[PDB]
Amino acid sequence: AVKYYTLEEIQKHNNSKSTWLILHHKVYDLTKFLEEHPGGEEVLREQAGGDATENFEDVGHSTDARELSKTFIIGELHPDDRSKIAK
Ligand code: HEM
Ligand SMILES: [Ca+2]
Ligand SMILES: [Ca+2]
């Protein structure tokens, strides 16, 4: 009962009205969060419409931040795109 979104669809959610990104094959709707994110808005905007897995780990996000991230999950990357995008 995973909801899947294609990469082609996710790429459209790249603006102030709808900003999504991908972390570890899951899709996060950060449209509203980016106004609250402690790391600022632009790092998230930069990533909108695509995968940001590497950026998210490289920062060293706290466990608290991971836990918070789960609240923004709206679905997962379609299986057809899971060799293009890794996990
Ligand atoms: C839904 C996903 C995300 C959530 C919930 C989130 C949450 C947070 C929170 C709560 C902090 C404060 C420090 C901490 O708790 O570790 C933080 C800091 C930061 N975040 Fe995120 N973040 C997310 C995604 C990202 C992404 C994808 C990037 C980069 C593209 C990013 C870049 C940063 C930076 C640069 C800081 C500031 C430096 C630091 O505190 O280490 N964040 N984030
Ligand atoms: Ca703000
Ligand atoms: Ca703003």
Helix residue spans in the chain (DSSP H): 7-10, 42-47, 53-59, 63-70
Does the C-beta of 6 come closer than 6 Å to ligand 1?
Answer: no
Q: How far apart are CA 55 and CA 50, in angstroms?
A: 12
**Beta-sheet strand order (sheet of 4-5):** 4-5, 73-77, 26-29, 18-23, 14-15
Residue nearest to atom 37 of ligand 1 (CA): 39
Class for the domain spanning 1-87: alpha beta
Task: Give the H or E element holding residue 75.
Answer: strand 73-77
Domains of the chain: which residue ranges? 1-87
48 phi-psi bin (left φ>0, alpha ψ -120 to 50, beta other): beta
CB-CB contact of 42 with 19 (8 Å)? no
Are the C-beta atoms of residues 48 and 21 closer than 8 Å to each other?
A: yes
Cβ(37) – ligand 1 distance below 6 Å: yes
Question: What's the DSSP call for residue 51?
Answer: B
Asked how this structure was determined, the answer is X-ray
